Structure formats: C-alpha cells, structure tokens
C-alpha cells in the first residue's frame, strides 16, 4: 500500500514535520506522496528534514500525481490510501500492520497531558513527539 | 550573586522559556548560566527569545563554566551555594559574604531515581554548601527573586511577603491553583513571569479533569 496526504495549508508545523518524518522512516519515500500543496510552493518551502528523507510532494491533486511521478503505479478507479480519530502516522502504522485510547502522558515535575487519539502499543509516537507534547505542557498546577 | 541552573533535559517548554526570560530580565544575562545541557545541544536548540536576551549555556557541568565564560569570577570551594530542600539552614543575609554562586540542581526523572545533590557533592566534595529557601517549593524565578531579596537587599526570609498556593480564577466555573510559594508585589499579587498568567489561562480553556 502507498499513501497520499493532502497538505493544502501554508507551512509545516513542527508536529506535522515529526509525523511525516516518522511515516517516511516507516514506509519509505517511495510509498508516501504529499498532494495539493499551495501553488506558491518550491523546494525551499519544504522542511530540510523532509527533503533529506526524499519526500515526494506536488501542487497538483492526487490525479496529477502520475503526471509528476512517472515511477508510480497509476491511480486506478476503485493500491493507494488517501487522507482528505487517529494521528496520521498512527493511521498509517495500523494499515501497514494489517497488510490505547486517550492515553495520559506523565512527565517529570508532576506534569501530565492526555492526547485525544487512539494509539498503537511492547503508545507509539513519532520520534520527538513526546518532547513536543512536553513543550506545551503547563508547569505543575491544579484545576479547581 | 550569580545563578547556575542545571538544565538536564532535552527541550525548553514554553513555561520554562517564560521563567528563564523573567530571570534574565531581573538579574541580567551575565549573571545566569545554564549548565549540563544534553551533549547534543547546539545554538540552534536554544529558543530565539532566550538567545536575544543573551542566555549563557553550556553542556559542561558547573565546574566547566569558568572555562567557557572567561569573564566570570572563579567558582571557589565553599563559596558555591546549592539549593537543597533536604537542608535545614535557610539562606540568610549574612550569607552574602560567603557565596558567589547559587546553584539549582538538575531535576531528573524516576528511571532510575537519582539524588542530584549527592551526585554533585560526590563529584566535588570541597565545592558546595547547602542552603534551604524556606519549607515550600518555589518556581525557579521566584527562588531567584527570593535569593536577591536576601543576599542583595539583605531582607531576611521571614520578612519577605509571600503567598502560598495562589489560585487564579478565570470564570465562575474554572480556577487554577499553582502549588508554589510566590513573592508578592506591592499590590498584594503574586509575581509571575511576563506571559505566565496568559499561559495558565490558555491551559484553563483546554481539556482537563478535576479528578
Ligand atoms: Ni485542589
Ligand atoms: Ni475545570
Ligand atoms: Ni491544565
Ligand atoms: Ni480527558
């Protein structure tokens, strides 16, 4: 299975960079395509971390993918899996498997954050995601 | 007095950036050093706000600071104070002649449990003298403000006006308690870093539980 992700909004959040990086490291650059990027986009609009991993991306929609990437299997009516709750990397991780819900992460200094998604468990996160979650977690506090 | 904070963790959380920024604005960039940063740290890892404020940092421990920052006075044995919650002697105004540096030991995880105070003292048994700052936990910026009041202004701990565990109410159904002792300003309000109350308010609007 190959994966297509529509990324239309401008710029790449750190969250998304970590997610796409994990996906690339798990299925490989030949199995992921970003489609429908803003017309503005050139190759320095793309994060260096993603470029280093060989990210396939285009401004064309998913039907223009075979136009831009001649080494890919044609998109046929009715092989590919498209992203128009799980995180995107979790969703892809499970699909790979086939072919814990609302986990609470507890950190140092009495901090904790629960994440509003289902995850795969020996929870699997993109590399660096735990640090990013920690980064937005507020100092030890009590809700009254 | 100069301040050393062991920052022995990857990353800078937003609340930590606000606290460090407040410390830098208060004591100055020449008087704060972050030490024992993860070995992989480069300037690119330091928040832009802190770089612009002149933050000094090193991956070396506190005994490597003088080598990295040649303008600083030497760390001298017995003249470096370690904040120590297990100590009984509070920092007093008379300690101002005794200490040149005040150290916040790193806070590490529970895997495995570590006693950073004992690690530091075992590494450098001639170096550190323990002091307490009262019997209630403070945020780092509050601890530094408190130390300034005691050492610079010569105000004894028992004469500083504090509030313990202030509660910040954002509406009739939501309030947040910060489980720390804070210094009061002259209007009777706890002194928080710029932006911190906003951050607390932002968290209040987000998903949370009360049990
Ligand atoms: Ni309570
Ligand atoms: Ni609430
Ligand atoms: Ni909260
Ligand atoms: Ni919940």
Numbering used by the authors:
A (entry chain B): 1 to 78, 100 to 105, 137 to 151, 163 to 184, 186, 190 to 211
B (entry chain A): 1 to 211
What is written in the article reporting this PDB entry?
Sfm1 exists as a monomer and exhibits a negatively charged surface surrounding the active site unsuitable for RNA binding. Consistently, Sfm1 has no activity towards RNAs but can specifically catalyze the Arg146 methylation of yeast and human S3, and the CTD is critical to the substrate binding and the activity. Sfm1 is the first SPOUT protein that can catalyze protein arginine methylation.
The crystal structure of a C-terminal truncated Sfm1 (Sfm1ΔC: residues 1−204) in apo form was solved by the single-wavelength anomalous dispersion method at 2.0 Å resolution and refined at 1.9 Å resolution, and the crystal structure of the full-length Sfm1 (residues 1−213) in complex with S-adenosyl-homocysteine (SAH) was determined by the molecular replacement method at 2.5 Å resolution. In the apo Sfm1 structure, all residues of one Sfm1 (molecule A) are well defined; however, a significant portion of the other Sfm1 (molecule B) are undefined owing to poor electron density (residues 79−99, 106−136, 152−162, 185 and 187−189). In both molecules, the C-terminal his-tag (5 residues) and the linker (2 residues) are defined, which are involved in interactions with an adjacent molecule. Structural comparison shows that the apo and the SAH-bound Sfm1 assume very similar overall structure (root-mean-square deviation of 1.2 Å for 202 Cα atoms); however, the SAH binding induces some notable conformational changes at the active site. Particularly, on the cofactor binding, the β5-α5 or L2 loop, the following α5 helix, and the β1-α1 loop move towards SAH by about 3.0 Å. These conformational changes lead to formation of a more compact active site and thus several residues of the two loops are either involved in interactions with SAH or in appropriate positions to interact with the substrate.
